[PDB]
Design a protein around this ligand. Sequence first.
Ligand code: ACV
Ligand code: FE
Length: 327
Amino acid sequence: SKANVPKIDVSPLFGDDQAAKMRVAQQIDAASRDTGFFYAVNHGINVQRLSQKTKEFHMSITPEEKWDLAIRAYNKEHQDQVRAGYYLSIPGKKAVESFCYLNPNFTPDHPRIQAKTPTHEVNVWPDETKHPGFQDFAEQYYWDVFGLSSALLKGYALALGKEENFFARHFKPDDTLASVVLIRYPYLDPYPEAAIKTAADGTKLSFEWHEDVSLITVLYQSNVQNLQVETAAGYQDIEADDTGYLINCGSYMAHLTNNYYKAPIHRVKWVNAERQSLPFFVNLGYDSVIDPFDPREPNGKSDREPLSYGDYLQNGLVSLINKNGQT
Ligand SMILES: CC(C)[C@@H](NC(=O)[C@H](CS)NC(=O)CCC[C@H](N)C(=O)O)C(=O)O
Ligand SMILES: [Fe+3]
């Protein structure tokens, strides 16, 4: 019934004790070849303050403000907002709602914003007088979770037999396509039946089976159990831990390693409870290309074609919406 999801102390990945880093890399390897999930602990981020500031924002924002920040799927006036902005709930039909923001260095003068390159957008923010300190807190949080994610990527590189900057050299403050999503899953009475899906095995869900669109995913959630992973023994429950970050690989890592580190298939159960789900999707730059390899082969060669991260991301975000629906 419960999935094997280990707790790994990732503090050595921030320092210079190389043998201690290798012992962390082995734990990452073992979890990646088993269920595909682990919890990162002793990460240094103040997650209680993150949860308090996010709750202050979700509970004070008003309908007027949501329409003013809405993405194109909800507001035809905002044609440049495909990824960044507010994703509304549909009272009586869709329960979840969220706020997505991208790299704070994507300003109006950034070269990729000037060129209108797909997947790059300038962030939108609420009024400062109505939400004092929110934008400054949220931009500082992007850089705090970016620093954690860079330490984790050093661990994945060592686990696969590569030098510690193998993935991190493609993950940079000036051009990362990474995103933060602040998701609110509400308590509702009565709960809308159209917002509850049912799986082939009978489980009630909020989001169906999928693989993630990311290199890795770095997730904080409230203490309410909800995720399941598909293993050889069927779907198993992932326990909650509101002091750590839940980590897993996305389908760009599976392509690069020839499915040695699989992107685990997972889904979200329906739970009638007020809770938070705050993912950071670790994406590389638009032109980043890592040549595919195969760790199970002596010469490390694979028969897969190289794919740029920008091409992967644009087609992956669309495929996920077509399969499981607009969020
Ligand atoms: C489990 C969490 C990761 C969360 N799921 C999600 O966030 C789901 C599935 S991984 N993710 C997505 O739909 C992709 C959001 C991408 C984002 N708009 C962006 O432009 O980069 C949830 O709580 O439902
Ligand atoms: Fe997911």
